[PDB]
Design a protein around this ligand. Sequence first.
Ligand SMILES: CC(=O)N[C@H]1[C@@H](OP(=O)(O)OP(=O)(O)OC[C@H]2O[C@@H](n3ccc(=O)[nH]c3=O)[C@H](O)[C@@H]2O)O[C@@H](C)[C@H](NC=O)[C@@H]1O
Length: 189
Amino acid sequence: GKILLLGPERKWLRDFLESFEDEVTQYQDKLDKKSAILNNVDFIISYGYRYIIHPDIVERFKQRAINLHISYLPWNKGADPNLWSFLEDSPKGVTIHYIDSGLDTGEIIVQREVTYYENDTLRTTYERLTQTIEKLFMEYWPLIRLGKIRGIPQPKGGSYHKLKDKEKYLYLLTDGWDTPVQKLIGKAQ
Ligand SMILES: CC(=O)N[C@H]1[C@@H](OP(=O)(O)OP(=O)(O)OC[C@H]2O[C@@H](n3ccc(=O)[nH]c3=O)[C@H](O)[C@@H]2O)O[C@@H](C)[C@H](NC=O)[C@@H]1O
């Protein structure tokens, strides 16, 4: 099969997907509805993709397009989920979900809670989320690749954030991504 990876290039993920004798193409720029990147694409995997996928593409690859989102949906849809999971003291984790119209609102395939520690920073928590979702994806990809799973509807509620929403809190990130998370718990409540 042919897998379209939307997001930055990741040799490990290419090699892993290519381990199942599938073809892998990568693209990280804005994707038009009629782009030839999509021809003969069996499955779309979005991971770090920084653009909204057109509803026409969504409906075309309905049930064949998943997104790796480093949040515990329905909480922290959209941008900067790791930061917001602390700013709003919400559940923390990673979710693999089918892609639908709207940002991070599709059916949930699998989730995993990720805990944190007293001396965690945004960097160490992000890295733990990354390792977890990448581990979680490899665990269930053999099952997902064969259409062996169906998702459950994402419960309404949770939360959603835009990139600009964090501007009012950047002053708390004294050490950038090396800022301890403890100084950020519930600061947005
Ligand atoms: C378009 C958009 O707004 N977000 C993307 C995507 O962005 P992402 O690929 O995660 O890259 P990011 O900008 O977050 O940071 C880049 C580097 O900064 C360091 N870092 C950052 C934040 C932190 O809390 N701690 C850190 O240490 C770290 O090293 C990281 O490699 O996140 C998804 C959740 C979004 N939705 C998916 O469904 C979108 O797909």
